Amino acid sequence: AALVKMGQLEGWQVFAEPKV
Amino acid sequence: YLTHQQKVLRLYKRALRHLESWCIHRDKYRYFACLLRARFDEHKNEKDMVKATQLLREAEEEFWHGQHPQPYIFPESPGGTSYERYECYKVPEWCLDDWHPSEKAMYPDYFAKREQWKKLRRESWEREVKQLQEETPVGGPRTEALPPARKQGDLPPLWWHIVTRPRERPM
Amino acid sequence: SWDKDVYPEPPRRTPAPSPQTSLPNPITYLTKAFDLLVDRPVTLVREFIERQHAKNKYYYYHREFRRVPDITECQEKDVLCMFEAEMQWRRDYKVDQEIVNIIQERLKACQQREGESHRQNCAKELEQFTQVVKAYQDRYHDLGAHYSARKCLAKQKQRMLAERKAAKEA
Amino acid sequence: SGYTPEEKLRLQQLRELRRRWLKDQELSPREPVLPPVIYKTYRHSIFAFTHVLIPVWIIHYYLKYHVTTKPYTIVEKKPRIFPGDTILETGEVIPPMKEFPDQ
Amino acid sequence: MLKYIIPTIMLMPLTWLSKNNMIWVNSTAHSLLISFTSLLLMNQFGDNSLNFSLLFFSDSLSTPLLILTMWLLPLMLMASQHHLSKENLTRKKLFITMLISLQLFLIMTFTAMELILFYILFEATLVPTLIIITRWGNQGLYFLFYTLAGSLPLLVALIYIQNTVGSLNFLMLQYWVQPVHNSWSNVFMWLACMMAFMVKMPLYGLHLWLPKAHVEAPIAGSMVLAAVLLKLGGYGMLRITLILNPMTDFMAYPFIMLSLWGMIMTSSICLRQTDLKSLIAYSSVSHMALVIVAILIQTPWSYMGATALMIAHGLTSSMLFCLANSNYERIHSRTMILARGLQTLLPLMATWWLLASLTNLALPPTINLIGELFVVMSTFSWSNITIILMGVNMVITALYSLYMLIMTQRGKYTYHINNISPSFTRENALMSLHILPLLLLTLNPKIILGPLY
Amino acid sequence: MNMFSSLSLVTLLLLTMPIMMMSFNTYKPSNYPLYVKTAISYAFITSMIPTMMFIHSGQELIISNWHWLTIQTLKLSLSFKMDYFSMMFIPVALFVTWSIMEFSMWYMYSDPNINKFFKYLLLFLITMLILVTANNLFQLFIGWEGVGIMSFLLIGWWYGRADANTAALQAILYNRIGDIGFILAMAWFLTNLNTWDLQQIFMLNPSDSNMPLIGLALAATGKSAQFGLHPWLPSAMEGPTPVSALLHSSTMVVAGIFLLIRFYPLTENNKYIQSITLCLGAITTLFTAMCALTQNDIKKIIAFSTSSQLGLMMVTIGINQPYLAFLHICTHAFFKAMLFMCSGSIIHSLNDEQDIRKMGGLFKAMPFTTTALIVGSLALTGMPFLTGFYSKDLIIEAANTSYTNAWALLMTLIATSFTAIYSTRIIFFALLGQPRFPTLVNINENNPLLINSIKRLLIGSLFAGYIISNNIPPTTIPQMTMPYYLKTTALIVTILGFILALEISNMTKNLKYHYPSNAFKFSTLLGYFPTIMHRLAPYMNLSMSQK
Amino acid sequence: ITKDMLPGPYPKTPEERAAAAKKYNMRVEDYEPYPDDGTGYGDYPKLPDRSQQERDPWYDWDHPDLRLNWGEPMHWDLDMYIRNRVDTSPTPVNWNLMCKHLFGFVAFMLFMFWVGETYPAYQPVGPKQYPYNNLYLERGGDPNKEPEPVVHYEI
Amino acid sequence: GAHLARRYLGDASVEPDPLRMPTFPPDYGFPERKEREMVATQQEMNDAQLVLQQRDYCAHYLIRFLKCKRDSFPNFLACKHERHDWDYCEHLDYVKRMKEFERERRLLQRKKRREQREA
Numbered sequence A: 001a002a003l004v005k006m007g008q009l010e011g012w013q014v015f016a017e018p019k020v
Numbered sequence B: 001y002l003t004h005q006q007k008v009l010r011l012y013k014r015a016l017r018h019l020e021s022w023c024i025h026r027d028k029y030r031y032f033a034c035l036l037r038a039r040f041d042e043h044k045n046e047k048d049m050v051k052a053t054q055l056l057r058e059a060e061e062e063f064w065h066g067q068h069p070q071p072y073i074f075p076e077s078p079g080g081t082s083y084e085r086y087e088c089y090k091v092p093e094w095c096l097d098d099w100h101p102s103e104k105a106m107y108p109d110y111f112a113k114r115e116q117w118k119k120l121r122r123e124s125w126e127r128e129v130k131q132l133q134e135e136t137p138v139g140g141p142r143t144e145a146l147p148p149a150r151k152q153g154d155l156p157p158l159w160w161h162i163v164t165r166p167r168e169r170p171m
Numbered sequence C: 001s002w003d004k005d006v007y008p009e010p011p012r013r014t015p016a017p018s019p020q021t022s023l024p025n026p027i028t029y030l031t032k033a034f035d036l037l038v039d040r041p042v043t044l045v046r047e048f049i050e051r052q053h054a055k056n057k058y059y060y061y062h063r064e065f066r067r068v069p070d071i072t073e074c075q076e077k078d079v080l081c082m083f084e085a086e087m088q089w090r091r092d093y094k095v096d097q098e099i100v101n102i103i104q105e106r107l108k109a110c111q112q113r114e115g116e117s118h119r120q121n122c123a124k125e126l127e128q129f130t131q132v133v134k135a136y137q138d139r140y141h142d143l144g145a146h147y148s149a150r151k152c153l154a155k156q157k158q159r160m161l162a163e164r165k166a167a168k169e170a
Numbered sequence D: 001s002g003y004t005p006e007e008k009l010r011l012q013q014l015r016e017l018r019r020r021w022l023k024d025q026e027l028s029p030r031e032p033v034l035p036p037v038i039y040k041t042y043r044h045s046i047f048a049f050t051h052v053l054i055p056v057w058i059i060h061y062y063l064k065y066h067v068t069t070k071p072y073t074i075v076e077k078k079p080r081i082f083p084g085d086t087i088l089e090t091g092e093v094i095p096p097m098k099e100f101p102d103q
Numbered sequence E: 001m002l003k004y005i006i007p008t009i010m011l012m013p014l015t016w017l018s019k020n021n022m023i024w025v026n027s028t029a030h031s032l033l034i035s036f037t038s039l040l041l042m043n044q045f046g047d048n049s050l051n052f053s054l055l056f057f058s059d060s061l062s063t064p065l066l067i068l069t070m071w072l073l074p075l076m077l078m079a080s081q082h083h084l085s086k087e088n089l090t091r092k093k094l095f096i097t098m099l100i101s102l103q104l105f106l107i108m109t110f111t112a113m114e115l116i117l118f119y120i121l122f123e124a125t126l127v128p129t130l131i132i133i134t135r136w137g138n139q140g141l142y143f144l145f146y147t148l149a150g151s152l153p154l155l156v157a158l159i160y161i162q163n164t165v166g167s168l169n170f171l172m173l174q175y176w177v178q179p180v181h182n183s184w185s186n187v188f189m190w191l192a193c194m195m196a197f198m199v200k201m202p203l204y205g206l207h208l209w210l211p212k213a214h215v216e217a218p219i220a221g222s223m224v225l226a227a228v229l230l231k232l233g234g235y236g237m238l239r240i241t242l243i244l245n246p247m248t249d250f251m252a253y254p255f256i257m258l259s260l261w262g263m264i265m266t267s268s269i270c271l272r273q274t275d276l277k278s279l280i281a282y283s284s285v286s287h288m289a290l291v292i293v294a295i296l297i298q299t300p301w302s303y304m305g306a307t308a309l310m311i312a313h314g315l316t317s318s319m320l321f322c323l324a325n326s327n328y329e330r331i332h333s334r335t336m337i338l339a340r341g342l343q344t345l346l347p348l349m350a351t352w353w354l355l356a357s358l359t360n361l362a363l364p365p366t367i368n369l370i371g372e373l374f375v376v377m378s379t380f381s382w383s384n385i386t387i388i389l390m391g392v393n394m395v396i397t398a399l400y401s402l403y404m405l406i407m408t409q410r411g412k413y414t415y416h417i418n419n420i421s422p423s424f425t426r427e428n429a430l431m432s433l434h435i436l437p438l439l440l441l442t443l444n445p446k447i448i449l450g451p452l453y
Numbered sequence F: 001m002n003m004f005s006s007l008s009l010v011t012l013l014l015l016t017m018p019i020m021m022m023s024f025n026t027y028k029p030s031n032y033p034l035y036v037k038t039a040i041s042y043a044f045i046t047s048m049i050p051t052m053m054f055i056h057s058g059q060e061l062i063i064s065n066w067h068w069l070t071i072q073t074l075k076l077s078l079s080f081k082m083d084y085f086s087m088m089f090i091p092v093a094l095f096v097t098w099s100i101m102e103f104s105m106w107y108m109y110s111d112p113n114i115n116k117f118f119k120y121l122l123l124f125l126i127t128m129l130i131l132v133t134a135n136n137l138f139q140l141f142i143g144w145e146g147v148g149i150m151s152f153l154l155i156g157w158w159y160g161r162a163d164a165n166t167a168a169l170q171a172i173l174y175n176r177i178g179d180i181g182f183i184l185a186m187a188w189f190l191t192n193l194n195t196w197d198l199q200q201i202f203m204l205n206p207s208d209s210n211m212p213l214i215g216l217a218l219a220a221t222g223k224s225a226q227f228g229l230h231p232w233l234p235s236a237m238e239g240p241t242p243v244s245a246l247l248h249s250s251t252m253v254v255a256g257i258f259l260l261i262r263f264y265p266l267t268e269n270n271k272y273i274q275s276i277t278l279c280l281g282a283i284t285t286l287f288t289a290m291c292a293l294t295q296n297d298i299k300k301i302i303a304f305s306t307s308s309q310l311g312l313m314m315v316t317i318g319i320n321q322p323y324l325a326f327l328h329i330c331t332h333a334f335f336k337a338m339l340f341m342c343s344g345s346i347i348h349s350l351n352d353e354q355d356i357r358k359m360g361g362l363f364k365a366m367p368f369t370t371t372a373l374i375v376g377s378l379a380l381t382g383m384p385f386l387t388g389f390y391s392k393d394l395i396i397e398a399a400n401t402s403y404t405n406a407w408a409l410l411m412t413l414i415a416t417s418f419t420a421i422y423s424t425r426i427i428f429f430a431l432l433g434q435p436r437f438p439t440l441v442n443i444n445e446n447n448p449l450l451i452n453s454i455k456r457l458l459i460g461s462l463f464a465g466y467i468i469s470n471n472i473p474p475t476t477i478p479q480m481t482m483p484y485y486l487k488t489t490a491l492i493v494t495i496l497g498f499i500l501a502l503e504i505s506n507m508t509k510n511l512k513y514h515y516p517s518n519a520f521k522f523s524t525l526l527g528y529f530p531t532i533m534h535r536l537a538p539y540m541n542l543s544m545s546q547k
Numbered sequence G: 001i002t003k004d005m006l007p008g009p010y011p012k013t014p015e016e017r018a019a020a021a022k023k024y025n026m027r028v029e030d031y032e033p034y035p036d037d038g039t040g041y042g043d044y045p046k047l048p049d050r051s052q053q054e055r056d057p058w059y060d061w062d063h064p065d066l067r068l069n070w071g072e073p074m075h076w077d078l079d080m081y082i083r084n085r086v087d088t089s090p091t092p093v094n095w096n097l098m099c100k101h102l103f104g105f106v107a108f109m110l111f112m113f114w115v116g117e118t119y120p121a122y123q124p125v126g127p128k129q130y131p132y133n134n135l136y137l138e139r140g141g142d143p144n145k146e147p148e149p150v151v152h153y154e155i
Numbered sequence H: 001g002a003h004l005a006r007r008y009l010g011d012a013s014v015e016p017d018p019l020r021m022p023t024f025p026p027d028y029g030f031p032e033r034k035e036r037e038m039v040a041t042q043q044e045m046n047d048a049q050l051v052l053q054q055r056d057y058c059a060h061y062l063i064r065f066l067k068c069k070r071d072s073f074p075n076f077l078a079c080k081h082e083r084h085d086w087d088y089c090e091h092l093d094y095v096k097r098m099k100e101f102e103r104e105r106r107l108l109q110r111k112k113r114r115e116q117r118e119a
Ligand SMILES: CCCCCCCCCCCCO[C@@H]1O[C@H](CO)[C@@H](O[C@H]2O[C@H](CO)[C@@H](O)[C@H](O)[C@H]2O)[C@H](O)[C@H]1O
Pocket: G096, G097, G100, G101, G104, G105, G106, G108
């Protein structure tokens, strides 16, 4: 929960879209 | 653990010693020591053993009130100022087995006699062990008293560490 | 033997003896024994050694580091220029440490030398020590173990901005 | 409250061995078998030379030519100057104090 | 560094190609020669480090650790060759090879210029270490926890830093370091960059693997573990803190509290330890808690003290394990109270016990005291109140150091122990090779003060 | 200057030579103790030459010969302060040690480790001279902790005896608690000033010196066994008698006072610190003098006598008379060392009996030990014109006429009366009366080593105070005007103490039973502080450590 | 040694008590485990909380300095109760009276020192007088700033 | 002394305060007061390296004694008269401070008497 809230605020990608 | 007699005699000695610490001077101690003996002689022939125990109990409570906070202690007694002073100087005899032969050669006569004792120890061990087996009831000893040697030529069982213990002033 | 300007000593003034007694002074007879027994043989041995050093004379030099551009002139992330500025700043940092050490030794020598009158007679040395310690503190204090020319420059700019802001306030 | 005959006998037997053991700790005449005012002045003279004179030569050499050759290594408290004194370095004479009130 | 890597590698062919009975003579003689040449690394400059190539470098921090590492290998060989006497030849040679490969990884670890190269070698040191302790030891959760909470997060953080900064070369990071701004993601980067080193120090609260490890390890394993392996954590933190500012200002607080309190706790525990090897292991936790504090407050004085403490502890703690091992090889027990009054039976070995104890309690002017003093001065500026905790720790340390000396060396000897043979020349030489260099470093302390000097 | 400095250092170097030659270099095990005694004898002579030069012209030196380490802006050099305090103390310490070493040659004759004993005594002396000549705090700390370690090794000399080891560890414990204050002072001076050198500390002369001086006072409390950290000094009697003589006179115990004397330029201006040191000294001198009134071990009485005198020195610090405190150090060394050697003479002749209740009747049986004991006792009690009168009497006058804490002044005067009582106690029970010792009489003091060592200290306890006080330059303005009842207070309270003590000691011969009052038990058991504290604190710490 | 002869978990049924008591060379009546709380004593016996100093010094102990016999169960806190550490011997004065007397003495002294500070002794004299403006320059005063003079007169 | 019983048990208003005094002008009741003369100069006391607490109105006698003590070495008994002159001068100095205390005491008593008289 604390991590999930942190990721929402910081925009941490779970399944990050390929970029490079 | 101690009989009633042994407790009365141990209090008598302890009371006298603490009295000595108070009086200091020998004439004064002699006077009060005789009064203390007269107190022990007052109830010497007490038959009622309930009365006698009560007398001993009160005696020990009176002793606790009257004891010296700093009684005299013989220098080498436990708690004395020389107690265990020389323990650092007591080296066990088995250390001699590890001497370099050049160290042993400075004392030929001593180390020759030392072999004889080691031989005497080895040849006696089996008979000492056998003696203790045939005198020990089934279940092991009930006390720590050891027996003497009962034949001629036998040595009392478990003698080595008593006979060859370090001297009290080893240097 | 050393630069008397860098490590100054005031002129010495020993008073001439004025003995008002008739007993001989044992310290004068021990001085002559010392000169005869200790000093002279020691001097002879040294004179022999110095003769050998004279036969073989060779020299060493004090390394001179040319000046290179400061960290203020280095472009961001330009390691080649930053490396030379950083190394120079470290050399200057080490030299400033020894400058403070020189001024501290002046102060300490003055205290012992002036004796009971040191509180009044060492005012100049105390004042100079006070100023140099301030300047050293401004340059280098509070930088941390990972100090650098960059962090020193950032500290300077913070101080300069505060001074500029205080000048306007006045 | 005495020894039982058993206790008496064991102590006697241990006593005999202990005394024989103690006697055997005595050294024989040959053991240990080792491998192969003038005097009062000599020791004091040799001791003075090796422990005072030689160290003072080393120390005096050390201080004179290595320690005092560096700045502020040996710092003297400057000599006291009293009125009336004469300074060797310059020859200056220090004027006497004023005249005291009678006391 | 190739002048040290290659000869160290050649110790392996030497050991395997040596005559059957010369394996200890050849490996010890030639590892001492390598240790001798390691003094060439003391070509250190006031401004620049000694940068050999694109892979390896040596500053004033890694040099003393390198010299300590290369000195320890010959000492470990002497300490081991008695209890490995009955092992067969091939297992003797395999044990020596493990020690050589551990030195090979260590010297490269302390000189790796790139942090990811450091990380790989930093983890390779565990392979020979665990083999040594298990295969020649006396008789899971921490491996799993350490990798989960230490090793793996460190790998991700280093890889992340390289993507962002573009490099992990330590020289490059000195010029491209950017400040770490407050953010939840940076809090995890900070912890990911430090937890692997804190576990290895160990940090108080993460320390219970160390007494367990020392109890199981053979003498050589305890020597390298106590002298060098713990200092990988200290060395790693001294390097990686370069790129963690200014976030270290507040992130250090919980770890400073753990160390300052942990100092007193582990020192106190030493008073009640019944096993010598556990007592020394807890003593190391106490000493290393001072190094953690010194690294975290990062002042010039604390870094000089931290470097001296790491070197001084390495010699002292290693010497204490060797002293305890010399008793174990006679009485075959680690219990401290079992064999007492040993000064009566082994007079010279009691002198080693005294000297080792005196350095352990940091008697001036030993480098144990110099390092400890510098940290005490630096933490006093950090907060004057810390002097109370530091002072109390000095008291308790002297208590357990002298308690260990008094319990084993003084009092009456134990009657029934009659196999206390005189000290061998091998053991006396081993002790003097710890304490002589340690006491000689008092004459020239500047070479173990690190790059902040 | 060249002869002054060379001879100052050769005094120290000469003392390390017997240690250096222990590494097989013409080392004569034959008579190593005699070799070490001769070195002390020659070191004393060479140290007299710099002292004479200082007495003459007041010459003073700082020798910073060797540069050891530079930590940025902090240079550490091996530096020696050959000043007033060093020039007077070193000759006194060497003179006393010379006698203690010659005494030890007879006292420790049978000890199989006689050579190791003299090595330790010599190391004890070297580490103490490092302490007193130190010019920087780090160098002082080397000597400070060096004497502490040598006390541990010498207190626990008979290491097979459990009480010896306990007493030795106790000394380390209490001294290390004081060393918290020592490192506190070092940390403050480095941070606030930028130095550990005494010269720069006195030149900057900080005004907010409460914290550094509290730290220094705490260090003095442990090392000089002031109240709170005092129990270790009486327990140090576990060591052989020569150790106590050196520990209690010219080493260890006075290092705490010496540290505060060296920092008088700072304490001169801190009235808060003067108050604290005054009160601490007053309770120490009174409390330990009370404990000595009921002790029966002759070495414990003299140990509590030292603590009481150390308290008086601490009082002198607190009234801002650092030079009188130093003079008491020097005078006290002469007769306190002699008293321990007289006690060892008695103890040796009665086969290691130390309880005065088993002595008596020795006045005629040991005439030379008796003479030294009476001379030593009279010096201690401030008998006019003996060595002790030239410091103690001035200290009482200075305290009487000072702007001072009144209760502290009172406690100090009472302790002066108590000094007479426990001095009377030793003389009465040891020398007078009838023999109370065993029947096989082995009393013999006709050994030249015994007579000569005591004799040199007996001469010291007669004229040293007069000789020293007439050579030292004045550094204060002594208070010489006061009412007759303040001028003679020390003499009166000392005489009343003798009168009171003789009455009580003569009551012991009456044929009347004797019951213990709460006050008697309080004195006998040292105010209960060791009993409560040495069981409670070890229990609390040890019990929490396991869990 | 075997697992049966090593310490075990807290004993539940009385039969485990008998086996534990024989393991520790004690009779079943004397054997008593520690409370079955969470500490982790197991079935290790709880023995009297007495220092080794209280044991008879004249008996021929197998360990004279520890006053222990071979095979006899060791107190859990034996290393705290050795003769070098915590003593629990009877004292001639009751423990509570010792504490009150000691604390009463320290409290009284600290109080009197406070009183002595508030009413200090001193002699009937005025302040000591110094020349040259109370030695303004000697005390380090600024020579460029003129000091406000202090004047002393005869009496 | 008795003077402490007065201040602490009796009336402190009429007893001098050692820290505060003098609390009256130095010329009150004193028509034309001569200043104390200092014989030794600042340079002389500086050059002699007198301790600061010794640099009082008797310093010139101390300077004289210290010079004699230096010129008579090794005779450490040769300057008794000079030592006494310094000792006596300090005695006169102390008496002056005793008079200052007494003068302040009588003035405080005088102030008390007037206040009653004005009341
Ligand atoms: C320089 C002068 C020094 C003087 C020091 C004086 C202060 C120190 C002594 C304080 C004693 C206080 O004692 C306090 O009261 C009494 C005894 O007094 C004690 O308690 C008990 O003492 C005695 C003996 O059992 C009983 O008669 C009393 O009835 C009872 O109360 C308390 O345990 C203690 O709290």
